[PDB]
Design an enzyme around this catalytic site. Sequence first.
Site, PDB file in Angstrom:
ATOM      1  N   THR D   1       0.821  -1.205   0.000  1.00 59.10           N
ATOM      2  CA  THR D   1       0.000   0.000   0.000  1.00 59.10           C
ATOM      3  C   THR D   1       0.861   1.263   0.000  1.00 59.10           C
ATOM      4  O   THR D   1       1.866   1.348   0.708  1.00 59.10           O
ATOM      5  CB  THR D   1      -0.969   0.019   1.208  1.00 59.10           C
ATOM      6  OG1 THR D   1      -1.868   1.129   1.092  1.00 59.10           O
ATOM      7  CG2 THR D   1      -0.217   0.094   2.532  1.00 59.10           C
ATOM      8  N   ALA D  49      -7.217  -2.092   5.652  1.00 59.54           N
ATOM      9  CA  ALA D  49      -8.038  -1.667   4.522  1.00 59.54           C
ATOM     10  C   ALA D  49      -9.518  -1.650   4.883  1.00 59.54           C
ATOM     11  O   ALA D  49     -10.245  -0.720   4.512  1.00 59.54           O
ATOM     12  CB  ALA D  49      -7.790  -2.579   3.321  1.00 59.54           C
TER      13      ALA D  49
END
Lengths: 247, 222, 237, 201, 238, 88, 226, 237, 212
Positions: D1, D49
Amino acid sequence: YDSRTTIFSPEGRLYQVEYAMEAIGHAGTCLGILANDGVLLAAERRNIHKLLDEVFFSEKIYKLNEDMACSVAGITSDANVLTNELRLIAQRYLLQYQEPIPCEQLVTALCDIKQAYTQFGGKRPFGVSLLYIGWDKHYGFQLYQSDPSGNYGGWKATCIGNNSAAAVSMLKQDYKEGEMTLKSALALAIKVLNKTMDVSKLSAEKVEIATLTRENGKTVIRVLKQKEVEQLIKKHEEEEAKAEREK
Amino acid sequence: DRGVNTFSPEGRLFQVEYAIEAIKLGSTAIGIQTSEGVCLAVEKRITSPLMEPSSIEKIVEIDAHIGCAMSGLIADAKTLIDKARVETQNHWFTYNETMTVESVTQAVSNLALQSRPFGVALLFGGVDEKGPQLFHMDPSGTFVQCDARAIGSASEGAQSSLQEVYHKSMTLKEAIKSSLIILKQVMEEKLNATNIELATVQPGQNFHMFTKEELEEVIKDI
Amino acid sequence: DRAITVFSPDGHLFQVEYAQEAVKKGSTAVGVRGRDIVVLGVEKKSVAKLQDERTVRKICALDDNVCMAFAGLTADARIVINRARVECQSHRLTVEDPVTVEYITRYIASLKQRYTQSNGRRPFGISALIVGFDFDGTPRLYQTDPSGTYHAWKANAIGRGAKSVREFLEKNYTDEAIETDDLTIKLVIKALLEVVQSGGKNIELAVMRRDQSLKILNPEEIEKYVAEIEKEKEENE
Amino acid sequence: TTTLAFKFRHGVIVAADSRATAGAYIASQTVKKVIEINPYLLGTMAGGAADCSFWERLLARQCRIYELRNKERISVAAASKLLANMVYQYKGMGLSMGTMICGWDKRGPGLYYVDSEGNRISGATFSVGSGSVYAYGVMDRGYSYDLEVEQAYDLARRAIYQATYRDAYSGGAVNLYHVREDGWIRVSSDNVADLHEKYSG
Amino acid sequence: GTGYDLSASTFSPDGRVFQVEYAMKAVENSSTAIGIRCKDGVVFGVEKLVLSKLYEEGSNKRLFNVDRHVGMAVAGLLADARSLADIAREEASNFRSNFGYNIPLKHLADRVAMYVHAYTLYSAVRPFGCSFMLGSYSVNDGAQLYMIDPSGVSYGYWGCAIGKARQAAKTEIEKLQMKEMTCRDIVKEVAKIIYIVHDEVKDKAFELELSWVGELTNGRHEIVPKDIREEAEKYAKE
Amino acid sequence: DRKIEFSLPDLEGRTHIFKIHARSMSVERDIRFELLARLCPNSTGAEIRSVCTEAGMFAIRARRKIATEKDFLEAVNKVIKSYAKFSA
Amino acid sequence: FSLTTFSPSGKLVQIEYALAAVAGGAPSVGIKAANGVVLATEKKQKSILYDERSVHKVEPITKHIGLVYSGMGPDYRVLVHRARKLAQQYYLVYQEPIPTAQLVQRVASVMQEYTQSGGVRPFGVSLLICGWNEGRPYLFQSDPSGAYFAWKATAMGKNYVNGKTFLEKRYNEDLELEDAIHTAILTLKESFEGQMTEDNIEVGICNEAGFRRLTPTEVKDYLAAI
Amino acid sequence: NQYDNDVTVWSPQGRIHQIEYAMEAVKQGSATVGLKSKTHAVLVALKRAQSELAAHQKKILHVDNHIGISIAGLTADARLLCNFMRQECLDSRFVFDRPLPVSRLVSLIGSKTQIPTQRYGRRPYGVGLLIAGYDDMGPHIFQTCPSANYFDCRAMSIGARSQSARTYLERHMSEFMECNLNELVKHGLRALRETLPAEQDLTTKNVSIGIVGKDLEFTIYDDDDVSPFLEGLEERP
Amino acid sequence: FSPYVFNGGTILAIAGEDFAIVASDTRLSEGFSIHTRDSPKCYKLTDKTVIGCSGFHGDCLTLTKIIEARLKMYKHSNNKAMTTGAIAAMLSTILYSRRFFPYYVYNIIGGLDEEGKGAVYSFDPVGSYQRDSFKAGGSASAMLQPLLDNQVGFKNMQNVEHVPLSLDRAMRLVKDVFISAAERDVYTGDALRICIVTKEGIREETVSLRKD
């Protein structure tokens, strides 16, 4: 017409609250006069039955904080709990801020609790109106009068007793701001108390007075004991005799 | 009798037969659900010119695809509209789609009577998968699907006129003019742009204010 | 018959109606917009020689850009200001942008509606009115009926004599007469001056100049504006 | 990420990677790591997430409710403060979340980094994720307040490309968004392989 | 009357609770019932008005099974009767969960009577409009039968009746010689007594709900097999 | 026996009550009185007589004894008084 | 509603009815002497079936606090139980002050749950409190609605008016020794109808040494030579 | 009459009056019939219409695949009962994966509605319920009155002028077990048509049908779905 | 004591041009012992939506039944079925509603949207989701996913036409990947339940795999 406390009138009046506040005029008699370097309270001792001992040392005047004191004029049942709550509020502020509570803030808190009592729920309004004298850093000596309606007022010479109209008229006639001192305030308070109490030559026992004075960085709330009160009475009597005879 | 819960001796509890007749004190409101969309017309009925017309609003958009018109105590309608918005947003957040106007009306009806009952009638209108729809919710926690509804002080006369001026295959252009002429017949003053609010519902458009004083193109024809 | 928070046979809400009629007992309150300044006055005429005029508090601030005035019961009004001020500080805590006048008026109206709801709570027999400059320049005025509602007004005219003063305002609410701050103030005067005697110092005006703090007009300047109003009245024979 | 977001005179540029991984195994490489809060706000995923997605959706419904109630669009600072206060009550419960809430409001372009631990600060530029440390340098070297829109696009694309190249937990596609005064617009979704092919020279 | 029969918390000038005095009237108005303790068990029996033939086979039956060995035959307001039956079922289940085994009938009757007294003591809640018999049998304690009035207390009954015609049923009950008759002939005789009580003289046709408990059923209070007790109904008809 | 009732005038009933009342006064039926019959739903026959009385009162207030062609003034006074009856 | 209530314009009608109820018929005189306080009451049991050593009218709340009361005895039991709990709680909070007379004013003040929270129906008993752990005695009265009065000599019976008149005419006075119990018995005699005996009259005394409910032996001894 | 004011109070003559008034709530409502068969349960409800523009409202509410109810009377506290029954049935599905038998559900409804008949300040649920369900013992039809005293019934109808429908069902209840689905639905339609005055007649828009069977889960048929059943009406208004 | 245990299982969904294939193994086991050879991980929820639940079997069962209850409630409250995207969002809300004690399960929803196009929504045990053309969940996720995306997605392949997948071809690839994963992953095998979702409904095929 009256009903459960939380009502209105067809006109739109809170007649229960108005009736309670008018009833406050009935019974009890206290007056507060504010002067420079000292603000005092004068109270009328209602029952002077010889079978009491006067050990509580105060009935009308209550010490509520280091820098303030009050005097109720309503039913004693609500008066006791209101004084306890007022002391609790003052000491809670002292704990929170580590500073004596300003008089206006304390009076606003008390009148807020009274407004809440007359606002919501099926609870009776607090049928008691009380004065407050005190000193603070911002405004100095202050005097406040709060009614059961919860609408307090910042006064400087007022009475809350039975003949409160006569007492306030006598005050207005013989009140002089600025020139007023602690001794002149004592003289005026004794004179107006003699006016509002029909029996002339009032005894020191039937009158309880307390003076709040500012010593060197410290507030002293002294209740005037019997000897000092009757000495004030004697001075007032001398003044009356001279004034009457000089005509 | 007087108890909000006690039933009447004859057939139906009182103090809710009193709450339902609160649109009588409320102002008139009319909505038409056509195949083109839903037309929501109300009167503002300004008492003094000093009050801003934008302040007085009887039609508030619950969401981008739902419009509501109130008739009664605006204070209670505020709470009902807020609950409608909260329910619509909660449904969209939970299911990632547009909550059906029927479901919103059902939720608001459920919250209508659960506290003294609310005294407002709502005219929900919006687009869904089942074409444009309009629902009339009433203070007594009851909702009914309707095609052309009237509500307010003179709901009887406005509804009677709408019963004969409405036809099943009309468009927005005819619906707005019919609603405006009916409104002018019901009200006391004329249908000035500062006094009449209009809300439009479109399948491919969000529901916005009707042109904001440029809507005279619809009242000049009237 | 029945005078509690229940629907009457003809509709209405008679306790709410009684609360709405209770504002008549109180004092007048006027205030106007103008895009340059909002000014509102009360004109209290009751001051004994022994009461301090500081603590009348007929107008009070909320967040140094929002101020409200009394019309009706004073204790209920003061409780309203306390709760509203707490809520403005909360809406300053969260949502770091300063409070908007419409938001605080909405909160006050919601509180009044909540108190009208249910039989336990007396329906807050106070009619408030709120002016102030928003964050985006535009100054606004809202007036809140005691029941549940608020309305954005150009002129408020709430209290005793509300009908006559509102008629006077709506008669000659000239924006060309608004223009300058001084013109706005002098328009509020001679309108509030019309109510009762208004002779010596009865007017109690308040001032909010854009981003300045709440300005309470000094008595000498109030007398100066009264003299200017008299001068305008003169030369008009 | 790896996500980055910076502001300039012509708007706000938001660049993010599209890789979500569970340890060594890559869960997916086509995840919309940028969340479209509303037609004028955008959010990013960093750390958990699911936490990011759920809390940004909750912020979206909250700001939609606020806009409907007050009939006015929400400001970026207000939304960031609201989300920070909302997530602060869960501090110490183990959830992790890093998001750069950005948009345009009455006062101009805004960009606030809200974190699960509690960080909520404004600033000209920000970057979060595993590859943020790599993104910061190349962003700072290529960023100026007077950059052209295409120059900002190229800067963001190159920065995310370098972050993916130097980080083992980032790659796939690069989602580029441009927030403008009239609302955000989706710019491009460039695969990192195509970016490498272009950048080979 | 007037201001004293408005809430159960208001005592009469003579010292009576008129709310329960009126709740007993509902039991007196509703259909009657009968329960007889046979030699080795207890036999119930209740007639039920089929107010309309639209109803199916006997429903909302006045007989209930409150526990495995305990049954309740109730009369009066039937909805509150069913609520009280649910209360009794919960009490029996709780006692079985706590102390094990099976709840003794005297203790169950005492507890349910105390609950009914709690409901008739206060003001907000109203006294139950139902009176019921609790019958059970066990090898250890034989057969017991307790009857609870809408406000009274459980009393041991060799044979009891409640409802529309209490005295008329009780006369023939006392005429019947119990304590030495088996539960079979007691089923026959309770059917006979119920048909002796008026059924269609001024009402509709009545159905005969009869219950069983005893050593012939080894406890296990169950409704008597209606197919084989139709002939008992026939004997009662004769 | 034979309990009967009405007091529920519809459009046709209201306009016929208008006609018989318009037979009195100095009015003529060239007025579109059907419009005012539609305006007032179920306005009895007493109010229609009241409305006709008001129309005559407005004519004398205007000091014009003519009412046959005074139809616009007829409609104006009837609608404003219908407004007053509903809300004054 | 659920508190002390029913206060119309200028009146406390429910409280006034409670005060009419506490008029009672049990004198229960109290005298504050220099050495201590004497609380004497009348136990005129109906017939001889009832017992006098079973129930008592004078209850020691704590070590040197004694209590006497008036009409509505069942209310008085709950009130004295509450007073005992409150005094015990105060002594537990402020541990080991031997709190009697620095508590008598305090326990009288905490007699606000007594009436200021009436409990729908206000208490119908007025109670006299005695304490002497300050070097000085104390006599206080709490009524169905008021608070401490700090009496020196009073009565709360059917003839409380003439009892108080007898107390003042007989000069309750200030120099009177602890044996003012003779004057208390004489005051009861005025409001007594019969030949009062040891079981018919119950009296408790609270001096600086403590409080003690006088047994029938000493009550009869004092009643002798009267 | 004093004794009729509140639900808690008991009339001297016997049964209380508030519950007797509660049964008038179902009486003042649109008619609805419900009949059993050997294998199917059918509800025929009159969708009462406010006006021709508005819809005919909603009746025959949906509870589960095997249970469906028809309301009659006070619609406010009827969606509440529908929610309660839905929640109980779904709880049964969640706990032991089986359709909640109709008798147990009706007993639960009776117990739930009994408490308001005894608790002060709580009105009885003045709703008539015609519950149609298919448990393992074939179809079942239950009637729930506001008195919380439910009944099982071969064929029962509730609503305004429902006595005529009751009489028709009673006279034709003998030939109910051996009837086809369409035949039973037509029996119900004839029963409901006999309720309204001769001016009214069955239309596709003002009627609703609820059918539950052994292999047929509960389905709410309306105008297009009702038309095949509405054919062969044998109209004798 | 710990409230979680890994029960294996492998689920997989593919979004086609007009079909949704949801395949899963039926072998339920933990540690080293196999409970049964028939325990399907596919569950049909509507006529156009089938979910797959892999991992902790008890949480799988509980989540499936909660989903059934919520669908039934929504159908009653809205008079219509629930769209595949809507049930995906509702499942996401449920998963994060128990974030601090999550269902140790992996959910993949395969079905048809309003447009009639294949939709596959993969899920995280704590609530994260994204629309995908295909995804595999379970123990064999690592060994099954690469085959299906490099075949269906034509990844790392050039000069090949991106032909849309036919139903038969997708089924053949599903069978191939499952039979390949069954032998490597001991949790996978003993059967395979394949659910085909189209306009005509849901068609299920049960094929036999390696019995060890």
